């Protein structure tokens, strides 16, 4: 049956989410689709065709491609130090939990950046002995700073530890995106558009809404946290509208951002999630080669027996690999799977897989900050099971 | 029986040594002492009244004691940053045997300087990672260079351990002599002579020779490897005259260095000796509080299963303290000692001690570089066993 609709379903009766849409396509046509419930609960207004969504760290896998396309293109390489590029990265420290700081052992490279093995940490990190001070640089929460003066805040401030020695999901992807920046003399989002978005037809994907955008998007509910001040426990899951301060505007020009910030739709990011299947435009474009495309999704960082932690939270049986998760164990995974199966997903319950054994892609988009029940993977449990 | 002699006398015989003197005080007094052997075999002429060794590393306790009065004074700490001093040392690096280096992840300290804990080497360390470039910088070769200026170079070069980590005799109590320079503004020849040797009546020690002192001085025998390259295997222990090349001037009034170049005699050794039994000159008045001196002379370093050694040559129960080796077991020393016996040695086989359990001073004068026979340590066995 159609595990997919009772899934979604219920999460709307059940007042967790306000409206979800998802799709699944299998040799790059739609399979499974559907939506559930509203655009806002408020007026409850029907969700808009082609309903625009806060994807946030759904952006990483995109700017993660654009880094491995101009890699092919011979711009930079995986080993190249980031301080060839903007010296402000010289010279970095490392600060531990028992307040000592010492100089960094290595330089952080464009590898490190794409693994968040760099030693950037969150704001919103738990106990990590650099957050406090990211949040009171207001690295995340100033979304009106342009991104090369976020970074040069950023810099100034210690890593957790020492390049290439330890894994810790982080603000990389911005410093990435900022290095592209620096290395190109262009900016990351109109490199986003002419080499990915423009090709692959994501006319509604972008860091501002498009002109006819704002009726379009869905709103956005949960609790941030009083001051950004890291929780020690979850808050009620409620479907109250969130207040996302000056985080994430809807129409500031040069807010660009590499570790979120993109707004787009299920349609737009299904036809990214099918390209990585090949590399491919749906007409044969190459946007990325096979092997760089293999070099991309391969296996890259291996976990303890902690396994993948953000904020403690596990990713079971998950690895990471260039562009985001990959699955390499499926007796350890703690839902439906297949080997290889990768993605990543978002705070606002955005997800999204690419499974090659089964030449299948699936996207749930939603809008719910900090969600206490894990949609995203409950929807690719049940694709897996009716495919 | 007078064992001392016996020893002395078959060093001679057997064409080991060429002039041998010796003295043991006891409650600040001689209690045995003698001579064996000539000034030198070309010509054996007697050893001359007075006569002039050049005690090498038996420079250090002498400079490490003009550092604890210092200290004293306030003029620095044991935890003072050498780079507060002279700033050529901030930004070190560190080498390793692995072509591997890094930024040094602690600063280097004056105590780390006394305890040979900085991660300095010395240039005829054989199998060093860096003593190749000490070596081709020529720092102790070059001994007509300024000390300031012997430092800018050393300063440029990495360490071969991070400062606090690890014990290897090196070239720091150099480094010590330069930043007592850049801490007082005088230089190091000046203080010595004005804080230790004027007031104990060493009117013989010094960086050069006495106006009177070319025919006291002793010759130097023995062979020193070509182009300084650390040999492999002893050479073989010959009664040639050693060429030290323009590593140890007679009459530059310019040179001073904190690792070796004194000049000295005997009985202005055993002053220095006998007045670490108490910090004070014969007549009473202090050079160092009985407080520093104890701090000064406590186990500081102490050592693995392979325990103390240079150019892996061993200190059997030796630990380190500020000035030089401390007895610290007995039953693992290899030649009779007592608990907390004191003192230190130099390349052309002088040796000294201290032991507080005896009020014992002793003191080997000859000149003889890289023996393979521990003169040294033989005359202090036999003045032990003589008590
Ligand atoms: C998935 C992408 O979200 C991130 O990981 C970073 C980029 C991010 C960026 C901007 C805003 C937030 C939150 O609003 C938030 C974070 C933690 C708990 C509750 C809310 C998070
Ligand atoms: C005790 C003080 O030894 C030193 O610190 C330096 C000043 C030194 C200076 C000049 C010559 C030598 C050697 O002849 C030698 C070194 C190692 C092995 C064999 C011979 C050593």
């Not at 869905?218 to 969130?242: D, I």
């Not at 979120?260 to 007409?283: C, I, K, R, V």
């Not at 993605?343 to 299948?360: C, E, H, I, R």
């Given at each position: ?5 009772n899934?979604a ?10 409206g ?19 655009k806002?609960?408020?007026?409850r207004?029907?969700?808009?065709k ?28 995986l080993?190249?130090?980031?301080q060839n ?5 010289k ?5 531990d939990?028992?307040?000592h700081?010492?100089?960094?052992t290595a ?11 760099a ?8 106990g990590?002995?650099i ?5 009171d640089?207001?690295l ?6 342009d991104?090369?003066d976020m970074?040069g ?5 210690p890593?957790?530890f ?10 990389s992807?911005?410093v990435?995106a900022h290095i592209?920046?620096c290395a190109?003399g ?8 002419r080499?990915?978005?423009?090709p692959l ?8 809404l498009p002109?006819?955008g704002?009726?379009?998007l869905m709103?956005?509910?949960?609790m941030?946290?009083l001051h950004?001040?890291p929780?020690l426990?979850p ?5 109250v ?9 809807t129409?500031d020009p040069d807010?660009?951002?590499?570790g ?15 390209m990585?299947?090949?590399?491919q435009?749906?007409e044969?474009?190459t946007?990325?080669?096979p ?19 953000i ?9 990471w690999?260039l562009?985001?998760?990959v699955?390499?164990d499926?007796?350890?995974?703690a839902?439906?799977?297949?080997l290889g ?8 319950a ?7 054994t ?5 996207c749930?988009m ?5 969600s206490?029940?894990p949609?995203?993977?409950?929807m690719?449990a049940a694709?897996?099971?009716m495919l």
């Amino acid at each position: 049956p159609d595990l997919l609709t009772n899934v979604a379903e219920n999460y709307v009766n059940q007042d967790l989410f306000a409206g979800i849409e998802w799709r699944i396509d299998q040799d790059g046509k739609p399979i499974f689709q559907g939506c559930a419930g509203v655009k806002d609960i408020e007026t409850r207004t029907f969700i808009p065709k082609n309903a625009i969504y806060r994807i946030y760290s759904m952006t990483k896998p995109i700017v993660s491609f654009l880094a491995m396309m101009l890699i092919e293109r011979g711009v930079f390489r995986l080993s190249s130090p980031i301080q060839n590029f903007d010296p402000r990265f010289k010279s970095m420290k490392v600060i531990d939990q028992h307040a000592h700081i010492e100089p960094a052992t290595a330089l952080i490279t464009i590898e490190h950046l794409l693994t968040h093995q760099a030693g950037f940490s969150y704001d919103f990190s738990l106990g990590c002995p650099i957050s406090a001070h990211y949040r009171d640089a207001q690295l995340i929460e100033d979304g009106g700073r342009d991104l090369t003066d976020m970074m040069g805040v950023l810099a100034e401030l210690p890593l957790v530890f020492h390049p290439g020695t330890q894994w810790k999901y982080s603000i990389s992807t911005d410093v990435l995106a900022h290095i592209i920046e620096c290395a190109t003399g262009e900016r990351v989002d109109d490199l986003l558009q002419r080499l990915i978005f423009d090709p692959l037809d994501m006319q509604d994907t972008g860091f501002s809404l498009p002109l006819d955008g704002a009726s379009r998007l869905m709103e956005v509910y949960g609790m941030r946290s009083l001051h950004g001040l890291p929780a020690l426990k979850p808050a009620p899951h409620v479907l109250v509208p969130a207040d996302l301060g000056s985080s994430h505007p809807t129409d500031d020009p040069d807010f660009r951002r590499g570790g979120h910030g993109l707004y787009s739709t299920l349609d737009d990011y299904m036809a990214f999630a099918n390209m990585l299947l090949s590399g491919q435009t749906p007409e044969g474009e190459t946007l990325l080669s096979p092997a760089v495309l293999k070099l991309a999704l391969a296996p890259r960082v291996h976990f303890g027996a902690r396994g993948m932690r953000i904020n403690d939270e596990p990713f079971a049986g998950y690895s990471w690999n260039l562009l985001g998760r990959v699955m390499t164990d499926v007796g350890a995974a703690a839902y439906a799977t297949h080997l290889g199966e990768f993605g990543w997903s978002g705070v606002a319950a955005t997800y999204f897989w690419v499974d090659p054994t089964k030449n299948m892609t699936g996207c749930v988009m939603t809008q719910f900050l900090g969600s206490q029940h894990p949609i995203g993977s409950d929807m690719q449990a049940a694709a897996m099971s009716m495919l």
